[PDB]
């Protein structure tokens with residue numbers, strides 16, 4: 260019963276050099292990094308990634324904050340990986356995010372919000388496949 264979710268450490272949190280602290284929150288919550296790479300998404304990639312929000316007001320900002328610098332992309336595996344990741348991340352608005360979460364601690368605003376996590380099983384499957392061939396996802 261170990262599912263997988265896609266996580267991105269966004270360019271604001273990479274720029275702060277806290278990849279390690281965030282990673283440790285995943286690992287101490289019993290999640291395992293089974294795929295990882297550092298990438299700089301093109302605008303096009305960010306758009307396909309965020310397609311589900313295309314005709315939305317916050318789309319422009321969400322793409323441009325995702326492509327402003329390098330990001331750290333990983334597949335996290337474990338029991339209830341998707342929801343555990345979401346608990347660790349906290350609310351999308353840091354202002355309304357609980358103490359001890361990744362966003363409360365590292366997010367500068369709604370746009371510069373430190374991380375992404377997949378929101379359900381179907382989005383997790385599609386996001387993992389977007390960034391990684393299974394050949395490079397190592398279940399352990």
Ligand SMILES: [Cl-]
Nearest residue numbers: 301302303326
């Ligand atoms: Cl551009």
